Design a protein around this ligand. Structure first.
Ligand SMILES: O=C(O)[C@H]1NC[C@H](O)[C@@H](O)[C@@H]1O
Ligand SMILES: O=C(O)[C@H]1NC[C@H](O)[C@@H](O)[C@@H]1O
Lengths: 581, 578
C-alpha cells in the first residue's frame, strides 16, 4: 500500500488531532461541486455530525434517501511544531467512495466505504495556520465495487440506491477523522505470528519502515515490564512463561517498535497484541491447541439516529449484552467495522470473523464488469487484512457472503481472491466465506477453497416456515446428511439462522413473527446442529434488529435480532444464554 | 470564579487535546479508594465510554442503580511544546461532585453536576511525557446541593438514590473532556450587551484577563470582515447597518479579543455572538423591539444507552425535529445543558430559557447551605452562557415551595445574585407548580415574566373529567387575569403520558388520541388570555425516570418518542405553530 494502516498514536515522534465534531455539509444533486469551486469551500452548507451516517437526521424523504455526490468540509488549526513532518489526514472510512482535498488541492481518492483512507497533505499543509479539508463523497451502488447494487433514476434525475444486499445504504463520514504527523522515516507496517513452545512462546515478526535505519523491537507485559527484545526488521521475540490470550480471558502484551539513529530514536510505534494460535485440525477449530466451539452472532454497525456512526457507547453496551448471552464470537457482517470494535474484542477475549464487503454478488460472474469487480474485491481484502491482522481477536477472514459459487467462472474468481488474501496474511489464519442455500453440496465449486465452511440457512423461515416447520427440519437434516456423506473432514459453522420477530408479538400457539416462534425455531435448529459432529460453531442472525431498505418484506428494517435495536432482549435471548452457558 | 468558563479553542496561543474515548472505571462501594491509593491508578478497572452516563451499559441491576463513590482514569501524552503554558483539565461536567487528580496529586473539587469543572495542572503536568488523570466522583443526592433528593441505605449497606425530581439519576462523565494549554496572560472572561440605534448597533463589552497588558477588541462579520475595533478592557463597538440575530433567522458576528504587549499579541480569544435585544414590556416579550410568542418544548439531555451523554448527532436530530414542528424555543429543563446545545441554537436562531438545577425543592438548618449551592450554580451558569444570543432568559427554579415568607427571602437572594452576574440584565423567571396558588404565592413578583407548569386534564380532572379540567383551568386563569399583573405568562409544562401505538376511540388517558385532545383543550384556554405569551410543551421526547408504579419505562409525555419519532400529537403542534 502507498500509506500506513496503523492506528494513530501520540508520543514524542507522532502527533494526532481529532477532527470529529460538526462539519459543514452540502448535497450536490446536479454534480456541479467540482465545476463550481466547492473544493475551496461549500457555498451553502448545513451542519453535519462526524462521525455519523447523514441519513436519519433529516425530516424529509429526499434528504434521507439522497443518492449521488455530497460534500463535507471542516477547518482545523495545525500547530507550528508539525512543520516539515509527514502530515496525513486519516479517515476511519469514507462511505462509499471519495476524493479528499486540502487547502484547495486534490490529495487522494478512494473506493470502498469501510476501511481507512489516508491522504498525504505534507506538501500542502500550513503549519501554524488554519487549514481546510473538503471531501467529495459518492454513495451510489454498482457492479464494479463492493457492496454491489444499482442506482435508479427517478423524476428530475433524482437518484435512488437499489442495493443487492439486505441493509440500508447508510453513507457519509461514519468514523472518526484525524490529522496526524509522522517522522520522515517511520514505521509503516508490521506483522506478528505466534508459536507455542510448552510454557514459552515465540513472537515472529516483520517490520516495514520508510527508510534504512536500524530497528529495535521490544515486548512489554501487561504491567509494562520488558520481557523480550531483538534487533532487526525481521526477528523472533522469545517469551518465557508466556501468558496466552484466551477466549473470554484476554491477556495483552505491548509491542514497541523503534527506529534508531544514534544514539537516538527516530520513531516509536506501540500496539497491544495477544499471544495465541488458531488452526483447523480435522473438523475442529483449535485456539491455543484446544478445541473451541463458536457461539455468538452476526452484527451490524447500526444504531438509532447515528446509523453506522461509531460510538464507544454502542461498543460497550453490545459487549455487555454479548457477555450476558455467554457468547464468544461475532462476525463483522457484512463489512469491516471501525477499528475500535477489534481493539475492544482484544480486551474482552472475543473471537472475530472479519468480513470484506463482498455481498450482493448473485442474481437476482460472467459480466464484462467482473474483472473490475475482482480488482475492487482484492483491494478491499488487502486493506482489511493489512489493517486487522495484528488483532488477537481476529481468527478468520470471511471473503464473501452469499455469492454465486456453482459455476467454473465463480471458482476462478474466488481462487484469485483467496490467493491474494493468503499473500497478505502473515499468520495464514483461516479463510472462509458464507454460503447461501443455492450453493448446493452437489453443485458448489468453491467450498474447497475454504479452511472451514460457513452456512447461512433459514429452514423454518424462508423455507417451510410456520405450520411446515417439521418439513423444514427434515429438509435441513437431508441437506446436512448430504454434506456429511461428502466426508470433507472440515468444520462447519452456521453463520446465519433466524426469524423476524416483532418485540411484543405474542401468540399461543406461535406464529411466524412472534417471540414464541423465534424460540421454537432456534430449538429446532439446535437439534439439527447437534446431530452432526462436524458442526463447530453457531452465529445467529442477528445480534440486533437493524435498518434496511424499505419494502413489503421489512417492517422498519430487519427484525431477526435477538435484541431490539435499542439493545434489549427478546424472549429468545435467554434461550441462547442458557444454551451457551 | 478562580478559572475561566470560556469554551476551548485552538490557535497560535491556545491548544487543546480531546480526552474523550474509553476510560478506566471502578465502582467503590466500600469507599476505600483514597486510602488504597486509587488516585495513582485503579486496581481492577473496567472500560467506560466518555462522554456517557454509566448506568445503561450494564446488564445487572446493582451496577445500573449504583449510588455512591466511583472512579474514572485515563492517560494522555502531553506535547513538549506545551511547556511554559498554563495547562488545565477541562470537564464539560462531573456528575454530581468530584475530586480531580493528576499524576497522583489532588488538584480541585467541585459540587454541581451540570457545569464545567476546570483543574489547573500547570504545576504537576509533565510535557513530553505520558500523564495520568484520575477522578473520584459521587452521585448521591441530598438537601444541600442541586438537584435535591435523598440517599437510602439498604440493609446490606448498598446505597440507592431517591430523587425529589422526575428524571433518572444519571451520572459519571457525561460531557466531553479536554486537556488545554493557555498563555500565561490570558483572556479569562468577557461580557457583551447590545443597544439598537436605528439601523446601527452598539456592542458594549467588558473583558477580564489574568494580567495587566492592553486589550484590543475586534468584531468581524459573518464573512470575516472587520466591522469595528476598539481598545481597552471596557468599551463600545459601533456597528453600522448591523445585521441583527433574529428568531429562526440567525446572523453571527465574531468577537476577537487580543491581549498585546510591545512586541505583539499574547493571547487571542474568538467566539461567535449575535446582536439582539431582549426585554419585557407589559405582557409582551420583545426581541429586537418586536413581540415574540414562544413556541416549543421542555427537553432533557436523554437518549438511549448514552443517558445524558453528549453527542452532536442528538443535537442535529433534535433541532431538525424542532424546526419541523415550527418551534422557536426550548427550556433547558432542569439543568444547564452541554455548551454545544447553545452554540447550535445560536446558529439556528432558537431562543433558550436557561435553567439552573433547582428542582426537587418542594415538600431546615440545611437551607443556608442549599442557598449557597444554588447561588454558586447560578453564577457558573450565567458566566458560562451569558454571551449566547440564544439565551434570552434565566430560569432560577422549577416547582419549589413559594408560599412562605421564608421562600421569598431565599429567592430574593438568588435573583439578586443572578442580576449581579448578568451583564445584560436579561429577563429572569422560574417555573411554578399549581400549589403556588395566585392567592398564596409570594415569589412571582420577583419574576420578569411568569412560567406556569400545569396539568389540567392529566393530574387534575383527567379523562372523563376533562370538561371539568377545562373549567378549573379557566377558573385559575381568571384569578390571574383579575390580578392585572401586566406581565407575560409562559406555560412551561403541560402534557399527558402517551404510549406510542395505544389508540382508542373514544380516547383514553395514555392514548395518542387523548394527547391530541388534551393539547387542543389547553390551546383553547391559552388563547383566551391576552397575557399568555408562550407555550413550551412537556416534553419534547419520552425520557428516563426512576422506576415506579407511575412510570412505564420513564416518562411518556414526549411528543416524540425517545428515539426521536413523532406521535400523533406532533402534527398538532406543527400545524398550530406554522
Ligand atoms: O434475509 C435475511 O435476513 C438475511 N439473508 C441473508 C443475508 O446474508 C443477510 O444479510 C440478510 O439480512
Ligand atoms: O409529572 C411530570 O411529568 C412533570 N411534573 C413537573 C416537573 O417539572 C417535571 O419535571 C415532571 O416530569
Amino acid at each position: 500500500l502507498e500509506y500506513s494502516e496503523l492506528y494513530p498514536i501520540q508520543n514524542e515522534y507522532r502527533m494526532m488531532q481529532s477532527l470529529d465534531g460538526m462539519w459543514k455539509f452540502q448535497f450536490d444533486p446536479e454534480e456541479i461541486g467540482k465545476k463550481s469551486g466547492w473544493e475551496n469551500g461549500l457555498p451553502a452548507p448545513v451542519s453535519m455530525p462526524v462521525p455519523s451516517s447523514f441519513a436519519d437526521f433529516f425530516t424529509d424523504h429526499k434528504e434521507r434517501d439522497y443518492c449521488g455526490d455530497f460534500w463535507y468540509e471542516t477547518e482545523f488549526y495545525l500547530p507550528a511544531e508539525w512543520r516539515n513532518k509527514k502530515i496525513w489526514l486519516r479517515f476511519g472510512s469514507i462511505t462509499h467512495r471519495g476524493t479528499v482535498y486540502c487547502n484547495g488541492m486534490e490529495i487522494t481518492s478512494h473506493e470502498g466505504g469501510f476501511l481507512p483512507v489516508l491522504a498525504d497533505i505534507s506538501t500542502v499543509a500550513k503549519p501554524g495556520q488554519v487549514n481546510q479539508v473538503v471531501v467529495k463523497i459518492n454513495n451510489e451502488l454498482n457492479e464494479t465495487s463492493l457492496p454491489c447494487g444499482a442506482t435508479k433514476i427517478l423524476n428530475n434525475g433524482r437518484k435512488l440506491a437499489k442495493p443487492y444486499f439486505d441493509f440500508f445504504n447508510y453513507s457519509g463520514l461514519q468514523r472518526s477523522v484525524w490529522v496526524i504527523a509522522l517522522p520522515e522515516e517511520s514505521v509503516k507496517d508490521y506483522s506478528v505470528d505466534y508459536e507455542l513452545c510448552g510454557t514459552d512462546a515465540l513472537v515472529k515478526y516483520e517490520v516495514v519502515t520508510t527508510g534504512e535505519h536500524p530497528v529495535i523491537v521490544r515486548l512489554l507485559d501487561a504491567e509494562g515490564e520488558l520481557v523480550a527484545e531483538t534487533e532487526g526488521k525481521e526477528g523472533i521475540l522469545q517469551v518465557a512463561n508466556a501468558r496466552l490470550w484466551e477466549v473470554r480471558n484476554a491477556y495483552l502484551y505491548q509491542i514497541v517498535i523503534l527506529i534508531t539513529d544514534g544514539n537516538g530514536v527516530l520513531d516509536e510505534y506501540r500496539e497491544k497484541i495477544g499471544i495465541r494460535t488458531v488452526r483447523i485440525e480435522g473438523t475442529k477449530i483449535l485456539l491455543n491447541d484446544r478445541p473451541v466451539y463458536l457461539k455468538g452472532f452476526g452484527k451490524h454497525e447500526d444504531f438509532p439516529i447515528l446509523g453506522r456512526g461509531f460510538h464507544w457507547g454502542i461498543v460497550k453496551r453490545d459487549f455487555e449484552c454479548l457477555k450476558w448471552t455467554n457468547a464468544n464470537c461475532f462476525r463483522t457482517s457484512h463489512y469491516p467495522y471501525a477499528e475500535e470494535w477489534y481493539q475492544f474484542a482484544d480486551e474482552e477475549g472475543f473471537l472475530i470473523i472479519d468480513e470484506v464487503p463482498a455481498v450482493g454478488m448473485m442474481r437476482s460472474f460472467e459480466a464484462l464488469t467482473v474483472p473490475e469487480l475482482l480488482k475492487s474485491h482484492i483491494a478491499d481484502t488487502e486493506e482489511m487484512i493489512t489493517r486487522d491482522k495484528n488483532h488477537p481477536s481476529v481468527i478468520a477472514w470471511s471473503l464473501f457472503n452469499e455469492p454465486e459459487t456453482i459455476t467454473d467462472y465463480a471458482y476462478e474468481y474466488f481462487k484469485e481472491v483467496f490467493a491474494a488474501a493468503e499473500t497478505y496474511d502473515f499468520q495464514s489464519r483461516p479463510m472462509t466465506g458464507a454460503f447461501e442455500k443455492n450453493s448446493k453440496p452437489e453443485l458448489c465449486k468453491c467450498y474447497p477453497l475454504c479452511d472451514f465452511i460457513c452456512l447461512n440457512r433459514y429452514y423454518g423461515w424462508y423455507i417451510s416456515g410456520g405450520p411446515e416447520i417439521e418439513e423444514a427440519e427434515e429438509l435441513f437434516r437431508d441437506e446436512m446428511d448430504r454434506w456429511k456423506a461428502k466426508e470433507l473432514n472440515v468444520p462447519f459453522v452456521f453463520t446465519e439462522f433466524g426469524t423476524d420477530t416483532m418485540a411484543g408479538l405474542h401468540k399461543l400457539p406461535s406464529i411466524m413473527w412472534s417471540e414464541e416462534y423465534q424460540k421454537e425455531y432456534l430449538e429446532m435448529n439446535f437439534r439439527v446442529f447437534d446431530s452432526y459432529e462436524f458442526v463447530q460453531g453457531e452465529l445467529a442472525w442477528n445480534f440486533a434488529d437493524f435498518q434496511t431498505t424499505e419494502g413489503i418484506m421489512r417492517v422498519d428494517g430487519n427484525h431477526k435480532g435477538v435484541f431490539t435495536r435499542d439493545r434489549q432482549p427478546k424472549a429468545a435471548a435467554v434461550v441462547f444464554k442458557d444454551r451457551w452457558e
